[PDB]
């Protein structure tokens, strides 16, 4: 009988991550972009939805 | 044995058939960018 | 009829979580010498 | 496309809204 | 250098 | 050069 496909993405027991960094890579622990001259050298507020 | 030299079949290894500079790039950048799997090291 | 009763296994949590009052600054611990008794573990409340 | 910024809000003397080291 | 006739790379490399 | 971290 004609059928329409569905797709879930179940992924549990883990946390999402978004490395604050230039190329999203873990090349260190004190990120290359958390040390820059526009974030660690300037105030900044943020809002995320 | 010039044929098995410039295809790196049985000859010099990677560390010394690269430039004195590209080995530096490939040994400094190996945590985020890996220029180590491209080249052939013969045995 | 009848039936069995759904199992309910009870047991103390993994690595005994939630049994040592962590991170609740209201009731923290202290590791200070019998000395100037200033607490040595000032735990935040927003750090888990 | 350097979408440049140019604006850094700090604060005379130059500390950025902050928070210092808690000591025991 | 005094018994190099082992798996080699360009230097007697496989000498450990 | 000059990069890696440590």
Helix H or strand E encompassing B25: helix B22-28
- The two structure tokens encoding residue F5: 């971290």
C22: nearest Cα among C39, C6, C41: C41
E9: nearest Cα among B3, B7, B16, B42: B42
> For chain C, where are the alpha helices, taking DSSP H only?
none
Q: Does A25 touch chain B (CB under 8 A)?
A: yes
In this complex, whether D and F touch, counting 3 or more CB pairs under 8 angstroms, is no
CA distance A41 to E2: 59
Closest residue of chain E to B17, computed from CA coordinates? E10
C22: nearest Cα among C40, C39, C46, C6: C46
Contacts of A46 in chain D (CB under 8 A): none
Q: The tokens 């809002």 sit on which residue?
A: A47
CA distance C31 to B16: 57
**Quick check: A43 and D5 CB within 8 A?**
no
A21: nearest Cα among C40, D11, F5: F5
CA distance E16 to A48: 55
Closest residue of chain C to D24, computed from CA coordinates? C40
Please say whether the beta carbons of C41 and C32 come within 8 A.
no
D5: nearest Cα among A43, A18, A32: A43
Contacts of B11 in chain E (CB under 8 A): 10
| B12 min Cα distance to partner chain A (Å) | 31
Closest residue of chain A to F5, computed from CA coordinates? A28
Q: Number of A to F CB contacts under 8 A, please give it.
A: 3
CA distance B15 to B25: 11
Cβ neighbours around B14 below 10 Å, total:
19
CA distance B39 to C9: 57
Burial (CB count within 10 angstroms: exposed 0-12, middle 13-18, buried 19+), residue A11: exposed
């Amino acid at each position: 009988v004609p059928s329409l496909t569905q797709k879930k993405f179940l992924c549990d027991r883990t946390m999402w991550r978004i490395p604050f960094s230039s190329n999203f890579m873990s090349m260190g622990a004190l990120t290359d972009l958390g040390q820059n001259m526009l974030y660690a050298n300037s105030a900044h507020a943020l809002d995320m939805t | 044995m010039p044929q098995w030299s410039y295809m790196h079949i049985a000859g010099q290894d990677a560390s010394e058939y690269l430039s004195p500079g590209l080995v530096q790039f490939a040994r400094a950048t190996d945590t985020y960018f890996s220029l180590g799997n491209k080249f052939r090291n013969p045995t | 009829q009848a039936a069995p009763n759904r199992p309910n296994y009870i047991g103390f949590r993994d690595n005994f979580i939630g049994l040592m009052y962590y991170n609740s600054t209201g009731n923290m611990g202290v590791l200070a010498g019998q000395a100037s008794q200033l607490n040595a573990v000032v735990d935040l409340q927003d750090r888990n | 496309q350097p979408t440049m910024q140019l604006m850094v809000p700090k604060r005379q003397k130059l500390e950025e809204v902050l928070e210092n080291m808690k000591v025991d | 250098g005094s018994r190099p006739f082992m798996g080699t790379w360009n230097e007697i490399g496989t000498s450990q």
